[PDB]
mmCIF file of C-alpha atoms in Angstrom:
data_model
loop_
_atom_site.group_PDB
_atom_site.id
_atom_site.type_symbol
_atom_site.label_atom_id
_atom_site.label_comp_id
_atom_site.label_asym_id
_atom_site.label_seq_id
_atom_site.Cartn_x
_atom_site.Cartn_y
_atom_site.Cartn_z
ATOM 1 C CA UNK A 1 -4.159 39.928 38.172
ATOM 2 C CA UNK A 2 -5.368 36.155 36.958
ATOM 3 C CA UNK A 3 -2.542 34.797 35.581
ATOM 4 C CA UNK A 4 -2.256 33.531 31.849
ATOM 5 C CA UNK A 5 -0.900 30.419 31.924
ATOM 6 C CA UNK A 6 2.287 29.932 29.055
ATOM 7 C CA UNK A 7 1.240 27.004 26.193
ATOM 8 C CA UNK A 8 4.930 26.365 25.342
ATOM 9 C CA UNK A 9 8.009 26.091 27.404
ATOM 10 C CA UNK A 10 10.315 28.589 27.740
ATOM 11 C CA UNK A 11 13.685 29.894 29.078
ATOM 12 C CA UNK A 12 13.437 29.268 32.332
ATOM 13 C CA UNK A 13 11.814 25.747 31.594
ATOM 14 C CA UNK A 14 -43.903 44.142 38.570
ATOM 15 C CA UNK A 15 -44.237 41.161 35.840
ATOM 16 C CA UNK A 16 -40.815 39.982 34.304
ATOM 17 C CA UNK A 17 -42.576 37.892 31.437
ATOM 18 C CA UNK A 18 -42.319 39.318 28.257
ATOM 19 C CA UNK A 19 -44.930 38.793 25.867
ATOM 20 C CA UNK A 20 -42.712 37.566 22.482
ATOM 21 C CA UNK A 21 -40.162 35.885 24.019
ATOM 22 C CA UNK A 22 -41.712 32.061 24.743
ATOM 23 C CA UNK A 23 -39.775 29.521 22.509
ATOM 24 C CA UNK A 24 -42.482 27.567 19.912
ATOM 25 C CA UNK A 25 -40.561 27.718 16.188
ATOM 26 C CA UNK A 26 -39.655 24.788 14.631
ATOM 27 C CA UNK A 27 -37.187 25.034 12.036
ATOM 28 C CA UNK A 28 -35.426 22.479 10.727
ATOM 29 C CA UNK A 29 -32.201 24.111 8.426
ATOM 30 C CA UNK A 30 -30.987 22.723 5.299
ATOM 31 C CA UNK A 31 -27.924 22.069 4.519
ATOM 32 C CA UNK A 32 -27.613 20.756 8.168
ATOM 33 C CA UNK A 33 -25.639 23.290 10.779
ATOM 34 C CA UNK A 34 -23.924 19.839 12.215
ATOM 35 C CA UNK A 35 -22.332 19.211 8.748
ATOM 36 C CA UNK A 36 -21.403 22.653 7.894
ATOM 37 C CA UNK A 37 -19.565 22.818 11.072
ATOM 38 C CA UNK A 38 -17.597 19.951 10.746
ATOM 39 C CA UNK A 39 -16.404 20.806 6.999
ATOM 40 C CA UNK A 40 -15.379 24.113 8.375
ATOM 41 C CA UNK A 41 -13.652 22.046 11.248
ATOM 42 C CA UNK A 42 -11.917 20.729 9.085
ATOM 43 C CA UNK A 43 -10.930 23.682 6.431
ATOM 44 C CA UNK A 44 -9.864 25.730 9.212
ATOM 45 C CA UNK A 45 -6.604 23.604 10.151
ATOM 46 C CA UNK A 46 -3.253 25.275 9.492
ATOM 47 C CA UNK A 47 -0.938 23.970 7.132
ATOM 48 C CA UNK A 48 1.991 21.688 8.466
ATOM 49 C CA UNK A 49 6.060 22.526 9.487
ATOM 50 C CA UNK A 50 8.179 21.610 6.520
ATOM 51 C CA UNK A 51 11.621 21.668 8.486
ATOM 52 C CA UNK A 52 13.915 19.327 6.731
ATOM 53 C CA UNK A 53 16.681 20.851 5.648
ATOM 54 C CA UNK A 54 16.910 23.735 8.405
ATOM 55 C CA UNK A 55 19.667 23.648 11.106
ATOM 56 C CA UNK A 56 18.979 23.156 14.467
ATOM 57 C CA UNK A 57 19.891 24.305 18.348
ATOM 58 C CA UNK A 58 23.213 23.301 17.979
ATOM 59 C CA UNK A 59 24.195 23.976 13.766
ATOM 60 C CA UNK A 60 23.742 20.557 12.529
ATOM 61 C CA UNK A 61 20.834 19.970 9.952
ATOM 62 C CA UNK A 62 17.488 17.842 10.595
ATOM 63 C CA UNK A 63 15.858 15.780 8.332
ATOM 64 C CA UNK A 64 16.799 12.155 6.838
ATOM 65 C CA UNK A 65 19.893 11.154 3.921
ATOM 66 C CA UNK A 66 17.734 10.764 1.148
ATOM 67 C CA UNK A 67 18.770 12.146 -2.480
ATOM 68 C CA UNK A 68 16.291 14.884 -3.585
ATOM 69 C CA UNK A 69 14.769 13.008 -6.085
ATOM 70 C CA UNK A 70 13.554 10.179 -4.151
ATOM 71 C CA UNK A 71 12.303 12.120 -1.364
ATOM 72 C CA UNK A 72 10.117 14.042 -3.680
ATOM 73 C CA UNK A 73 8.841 10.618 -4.858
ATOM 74 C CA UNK A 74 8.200 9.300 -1.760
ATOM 75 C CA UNK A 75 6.239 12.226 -0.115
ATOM 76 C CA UNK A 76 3.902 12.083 -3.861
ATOM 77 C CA UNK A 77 3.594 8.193 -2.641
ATOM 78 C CA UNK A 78 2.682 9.516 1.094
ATOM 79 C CA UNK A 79 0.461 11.728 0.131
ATOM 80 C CA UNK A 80 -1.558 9.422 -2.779
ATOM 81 C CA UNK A 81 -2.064 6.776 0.077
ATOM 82 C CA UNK A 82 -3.228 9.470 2.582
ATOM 83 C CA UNK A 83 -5.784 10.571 -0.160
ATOM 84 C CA UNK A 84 -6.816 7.030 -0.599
ATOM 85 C CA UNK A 85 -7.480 6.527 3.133
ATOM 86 C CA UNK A 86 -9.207 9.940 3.140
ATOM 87 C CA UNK A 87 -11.627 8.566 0.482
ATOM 88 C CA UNK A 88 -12.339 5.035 2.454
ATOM 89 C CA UNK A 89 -10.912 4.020 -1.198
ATOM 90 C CA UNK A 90 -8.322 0.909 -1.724
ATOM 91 C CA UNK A 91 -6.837 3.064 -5.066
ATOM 92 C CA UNK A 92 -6.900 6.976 -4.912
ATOM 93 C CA UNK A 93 -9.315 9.133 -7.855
ATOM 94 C CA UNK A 94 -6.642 11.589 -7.851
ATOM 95 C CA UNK A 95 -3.008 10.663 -7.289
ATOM 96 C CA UNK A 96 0.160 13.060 -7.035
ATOM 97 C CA UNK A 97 2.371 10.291 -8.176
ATOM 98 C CA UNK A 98 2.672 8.195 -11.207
ATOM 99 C CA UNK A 99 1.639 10.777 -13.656
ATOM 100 C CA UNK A 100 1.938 11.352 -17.134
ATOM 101 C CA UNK A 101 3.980 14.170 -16.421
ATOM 102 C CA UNK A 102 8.120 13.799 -16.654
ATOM 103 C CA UNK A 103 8.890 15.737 -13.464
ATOM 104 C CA UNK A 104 12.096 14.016 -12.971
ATOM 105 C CA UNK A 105 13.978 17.595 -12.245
ATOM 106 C CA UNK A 106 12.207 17.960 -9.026
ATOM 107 C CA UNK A 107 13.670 18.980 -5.830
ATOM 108 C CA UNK A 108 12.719 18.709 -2.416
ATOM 109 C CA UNK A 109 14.539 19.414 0.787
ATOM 110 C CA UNK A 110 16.689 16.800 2.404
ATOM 111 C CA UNK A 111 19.004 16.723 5.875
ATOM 112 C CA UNK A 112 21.231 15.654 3.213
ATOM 113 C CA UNK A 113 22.954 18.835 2.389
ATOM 114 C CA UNK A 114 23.961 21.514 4.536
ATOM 115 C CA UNK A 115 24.246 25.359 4.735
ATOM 116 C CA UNK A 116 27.064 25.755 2.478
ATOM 117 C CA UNK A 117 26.363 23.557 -0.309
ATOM 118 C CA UNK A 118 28.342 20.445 1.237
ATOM 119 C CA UNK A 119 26.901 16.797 2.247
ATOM 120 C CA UNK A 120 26.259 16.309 5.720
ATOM 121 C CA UNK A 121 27.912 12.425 5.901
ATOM 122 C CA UNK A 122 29.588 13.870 8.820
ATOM 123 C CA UNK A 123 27.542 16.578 11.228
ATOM 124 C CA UNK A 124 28.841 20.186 11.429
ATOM 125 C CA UNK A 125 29.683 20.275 15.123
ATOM 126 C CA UNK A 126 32.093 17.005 14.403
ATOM 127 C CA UNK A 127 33.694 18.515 11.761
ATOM 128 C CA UNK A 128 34.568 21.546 14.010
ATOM 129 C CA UNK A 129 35.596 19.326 16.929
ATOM 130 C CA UNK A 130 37.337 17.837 13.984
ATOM 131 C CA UNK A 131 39.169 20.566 12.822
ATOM 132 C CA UNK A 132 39.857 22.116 16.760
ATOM 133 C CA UNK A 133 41.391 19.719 17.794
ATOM 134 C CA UNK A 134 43.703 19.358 14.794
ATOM 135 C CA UNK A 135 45.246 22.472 16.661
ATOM 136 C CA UNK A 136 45.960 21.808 20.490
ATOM 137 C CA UNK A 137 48.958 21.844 22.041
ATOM 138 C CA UNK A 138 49.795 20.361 25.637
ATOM 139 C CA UNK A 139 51.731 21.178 28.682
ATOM 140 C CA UNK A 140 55.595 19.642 28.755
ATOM 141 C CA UNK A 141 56.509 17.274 31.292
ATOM 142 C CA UNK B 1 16.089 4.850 -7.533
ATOM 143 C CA UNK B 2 19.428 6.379 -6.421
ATOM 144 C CA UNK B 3 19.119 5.741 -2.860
ATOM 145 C CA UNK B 4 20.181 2.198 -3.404
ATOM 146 C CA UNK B 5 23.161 0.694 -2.572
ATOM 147 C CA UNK B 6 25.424 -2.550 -3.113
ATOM 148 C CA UNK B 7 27.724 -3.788 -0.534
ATOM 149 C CA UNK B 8 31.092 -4.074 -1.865
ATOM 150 C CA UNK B 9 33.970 -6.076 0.868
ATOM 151 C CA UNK B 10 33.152 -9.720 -0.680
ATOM 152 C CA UNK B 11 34.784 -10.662 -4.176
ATOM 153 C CA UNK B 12 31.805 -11.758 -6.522
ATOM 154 C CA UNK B 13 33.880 -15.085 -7.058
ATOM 155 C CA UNK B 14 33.471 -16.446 -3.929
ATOM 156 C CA UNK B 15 29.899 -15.745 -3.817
ATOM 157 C CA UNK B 16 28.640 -19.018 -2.175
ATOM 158 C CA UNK B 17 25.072 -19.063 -3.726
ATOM 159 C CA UNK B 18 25.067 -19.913 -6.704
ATOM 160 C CA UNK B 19 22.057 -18.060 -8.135
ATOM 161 C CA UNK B 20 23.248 -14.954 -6.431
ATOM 162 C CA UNK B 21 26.264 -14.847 -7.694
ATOM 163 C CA UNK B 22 24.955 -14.908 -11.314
ATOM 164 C CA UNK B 23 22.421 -12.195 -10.763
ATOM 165 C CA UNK B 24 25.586 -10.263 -9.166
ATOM 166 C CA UNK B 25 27.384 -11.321 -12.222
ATOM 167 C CA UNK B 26 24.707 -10.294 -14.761
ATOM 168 C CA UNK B 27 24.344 -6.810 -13.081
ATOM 169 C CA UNK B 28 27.992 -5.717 -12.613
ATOM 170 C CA UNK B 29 28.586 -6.484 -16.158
ATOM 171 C CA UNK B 30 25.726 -4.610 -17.548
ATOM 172 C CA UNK B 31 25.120 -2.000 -15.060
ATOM 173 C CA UNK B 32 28.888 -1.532 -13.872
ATOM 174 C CA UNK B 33 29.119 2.292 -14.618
ATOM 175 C CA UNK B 34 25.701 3.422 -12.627
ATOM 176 C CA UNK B 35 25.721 1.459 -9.351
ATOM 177 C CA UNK B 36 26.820 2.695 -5.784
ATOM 178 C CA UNK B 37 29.254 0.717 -4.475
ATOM 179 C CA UNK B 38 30.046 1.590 -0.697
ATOM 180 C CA UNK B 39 32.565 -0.112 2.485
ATOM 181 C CA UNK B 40 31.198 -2.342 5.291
ATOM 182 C CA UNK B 41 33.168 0.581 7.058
ATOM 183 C CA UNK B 42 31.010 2.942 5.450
ATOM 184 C CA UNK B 43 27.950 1.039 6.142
ATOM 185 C CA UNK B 44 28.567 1.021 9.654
ATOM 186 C CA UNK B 45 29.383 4.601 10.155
ATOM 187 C CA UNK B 46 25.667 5.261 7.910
ATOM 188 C CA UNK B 47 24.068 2.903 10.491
ATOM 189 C CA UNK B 48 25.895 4.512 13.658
ATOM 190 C CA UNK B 49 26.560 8.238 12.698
ATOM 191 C CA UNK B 50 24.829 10.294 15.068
ATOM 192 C CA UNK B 51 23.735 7.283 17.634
ATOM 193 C CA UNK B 52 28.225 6.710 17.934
ATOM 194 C CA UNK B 53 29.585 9.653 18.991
ATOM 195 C CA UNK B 54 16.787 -21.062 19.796
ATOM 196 C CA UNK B 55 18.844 -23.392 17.540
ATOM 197 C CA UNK B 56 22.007 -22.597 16.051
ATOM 198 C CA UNK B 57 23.228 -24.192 13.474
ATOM 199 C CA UNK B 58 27.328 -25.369 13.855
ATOM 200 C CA UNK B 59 28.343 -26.033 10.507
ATOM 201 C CA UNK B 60 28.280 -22.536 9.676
ATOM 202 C CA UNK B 61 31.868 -21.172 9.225
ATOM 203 C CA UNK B 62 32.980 -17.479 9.007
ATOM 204 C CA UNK B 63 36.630 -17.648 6.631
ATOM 205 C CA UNK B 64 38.816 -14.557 5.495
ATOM 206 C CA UNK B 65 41.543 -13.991 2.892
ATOM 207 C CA UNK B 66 45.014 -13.413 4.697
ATOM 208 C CA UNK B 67 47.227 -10.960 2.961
ATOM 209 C CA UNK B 68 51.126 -11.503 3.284
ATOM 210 C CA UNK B 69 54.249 -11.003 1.950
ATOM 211 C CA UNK B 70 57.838 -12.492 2.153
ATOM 212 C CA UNK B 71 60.728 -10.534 3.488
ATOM 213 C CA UNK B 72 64.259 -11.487 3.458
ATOM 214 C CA UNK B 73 65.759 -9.559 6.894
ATOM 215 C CA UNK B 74 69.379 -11.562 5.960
ATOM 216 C CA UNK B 75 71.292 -8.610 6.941
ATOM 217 C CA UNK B 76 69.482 -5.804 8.853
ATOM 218 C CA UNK B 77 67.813 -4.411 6.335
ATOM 219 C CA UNK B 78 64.769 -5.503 4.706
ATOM 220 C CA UNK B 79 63.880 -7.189 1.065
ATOM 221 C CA UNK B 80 60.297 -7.643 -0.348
ATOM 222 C CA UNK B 81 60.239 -10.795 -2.453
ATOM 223 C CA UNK B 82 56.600 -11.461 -3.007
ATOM 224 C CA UNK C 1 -20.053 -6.649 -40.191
ATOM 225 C CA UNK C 2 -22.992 -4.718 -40.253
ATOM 226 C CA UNK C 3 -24.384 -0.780 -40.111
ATOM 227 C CA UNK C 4 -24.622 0.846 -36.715
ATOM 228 C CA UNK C 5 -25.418 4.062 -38.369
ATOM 229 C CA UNK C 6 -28.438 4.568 -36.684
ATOM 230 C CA UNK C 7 -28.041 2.922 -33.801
ATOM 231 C CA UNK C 8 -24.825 5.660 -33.138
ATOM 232 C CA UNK C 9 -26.343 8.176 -33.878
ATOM 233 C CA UNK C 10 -29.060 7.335 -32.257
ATOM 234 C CA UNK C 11 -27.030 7.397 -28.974
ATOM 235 C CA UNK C 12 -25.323 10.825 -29.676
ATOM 236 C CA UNK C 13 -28.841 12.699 -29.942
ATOM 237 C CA UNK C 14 -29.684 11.300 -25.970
ATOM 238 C CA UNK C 15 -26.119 12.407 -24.560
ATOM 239 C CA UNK C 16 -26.283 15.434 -26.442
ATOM 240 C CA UNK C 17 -29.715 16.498 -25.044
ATOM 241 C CA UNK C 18 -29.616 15.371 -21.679
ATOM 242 C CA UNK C 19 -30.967 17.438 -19.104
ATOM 243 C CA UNK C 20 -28.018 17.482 -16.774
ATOM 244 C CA UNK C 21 -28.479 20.972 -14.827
ATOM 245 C CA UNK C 22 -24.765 21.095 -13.939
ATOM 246 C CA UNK C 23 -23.467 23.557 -16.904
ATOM 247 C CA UNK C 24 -25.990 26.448 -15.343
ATOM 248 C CA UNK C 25 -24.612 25.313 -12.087
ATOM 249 C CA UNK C 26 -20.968 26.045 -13.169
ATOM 250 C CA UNK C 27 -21.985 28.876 -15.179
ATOM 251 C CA UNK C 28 -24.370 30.878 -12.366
ATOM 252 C CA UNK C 29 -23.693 29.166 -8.734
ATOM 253 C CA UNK C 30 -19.962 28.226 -8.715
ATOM 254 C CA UNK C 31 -18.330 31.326 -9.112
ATOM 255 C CA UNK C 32 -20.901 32.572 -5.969
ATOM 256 C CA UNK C 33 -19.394 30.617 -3.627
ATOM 257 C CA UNK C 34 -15.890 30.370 -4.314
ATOM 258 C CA UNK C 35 -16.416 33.854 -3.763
ATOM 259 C CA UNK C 36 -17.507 33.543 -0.410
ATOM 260 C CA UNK C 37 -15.198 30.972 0.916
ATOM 261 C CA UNK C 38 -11.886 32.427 -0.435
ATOM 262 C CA UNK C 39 -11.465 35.470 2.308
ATOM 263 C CA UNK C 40 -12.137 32.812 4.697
ATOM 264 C CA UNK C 41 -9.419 30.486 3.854
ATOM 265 C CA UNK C 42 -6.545 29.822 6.194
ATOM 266 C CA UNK C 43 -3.949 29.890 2.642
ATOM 267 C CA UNK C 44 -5.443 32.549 0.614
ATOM 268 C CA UNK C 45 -5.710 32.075 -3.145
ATOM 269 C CA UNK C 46 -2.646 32.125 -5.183
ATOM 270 C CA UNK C 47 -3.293 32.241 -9.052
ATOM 271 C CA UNK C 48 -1.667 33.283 -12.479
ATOM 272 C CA UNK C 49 -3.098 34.157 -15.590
#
């Protein structure tokens, strides 16, 4: 009957002494259970919402106007400096930018483009007011 | 990178700087085929689509370019000179 | 200017019998525990050819 309470919002939102048992090992483990636990800590995280692109409550599309191209460039340059602070490093070892690879047909997802294959310079649910109201008629005097 | 973009509205002539208008210049001539030219109308609706729905100094001026045309009304109708 | 023959060579013979320990590491203890982790993993392995 103890409730559960919701994470996310909703809708409507003799001798007893046993003769092995007394506590004298001393072990010390190596590698150290303290470290282990972190890394696994850390391993265990899920991955991250990649939502650009996708519509939302209402139709229109979420993310940023950015062409395709650049986006992809700019996430490689997020994620190199993330590495680099990960690494208590000024430059990054490994970098996902500024290869010697010519990647320059990449994609990524963008709030640029909706749906339907059109650009989203205007949002969906103007357009349809837009085009609804190109229609009305009114009462005569 | 093609997210950048050059603000059109101001003829490179009257460029006041002088520096500035010969980098302008140097680029339109070269580069004239491959750059993005956009409105101050557009620019405004980019900066307000979804949000729309000390000393000063005096001898700074703001001038515009008046566009006009003679009309000769003699009789009632109407006659575009120039 | 001069012959670094056998100072070159020389060098070659050290690096090429070091006794780095890491080649019987790849070879014997590596594949071990990528074993063990991978069923673990929250994105589980992905791999071609």
């Amino acid at each position: 009957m103890k409730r559960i309470p919701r994470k996310t919002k909703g809708k409507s939102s003799p001798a007893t002494t046993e003769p092995g048992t007394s506590n004298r090992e001393q072990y010390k483990a190596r590698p150290g259970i303290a470290s282990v636990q972190r890394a696994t800590e850390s391993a265990e995280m899920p991955m991250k919402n990649n939502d650009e692109g996708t519509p939302d409550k209402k139709g229109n599309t979420k993310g940023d106007l950015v062409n395709e191209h650049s986006e992809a460039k700019d996430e490689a340059d997020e994620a190199t400096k993330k590495q680099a602070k990960d690494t208590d490093k000024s430059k990054a070892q490994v970098t996902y930018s500024d290869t010697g690879i010519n990647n320059a047909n990449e994609l990524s997802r963008s709030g640029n483009v909706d749906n339907e294959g059109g650009s989203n310079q205007k949002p969906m649910s103007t357009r349809i007011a837009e085009a609804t109201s190109a229609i009305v008629s009114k009462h005569p005097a | 990178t093609p997210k950048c973009f050059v603000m059109s509205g101001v003829d490179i002539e009257s460029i006041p700087n002088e520096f500035i208008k010969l980098f302008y210049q140097r680029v339109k001539s070269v580069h004239a085929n491959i750059l993005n030219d956009i409105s101050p109308q557009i620019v405004s609706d980019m900066i307000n689509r979804k949000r729309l729905r000390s000393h000063v100094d005096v001898y700074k001026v703001d001038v515009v370019d008046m566009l006009f045309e003679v009309v000769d009304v003699a009789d009632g109708l109407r006659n575009v000179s120039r | 200017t001069q012959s670094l023959v056998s100072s070159m060579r020389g060098t070659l013979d050290k690096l090429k019998l070091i006794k780095s320990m890491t080649p019987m590491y790849l070879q014997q203890l590596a594949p071990v525990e990528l074993a063990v982790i991978a069923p673990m993993l929250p994105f589980p392995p992905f791999q071609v050819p």
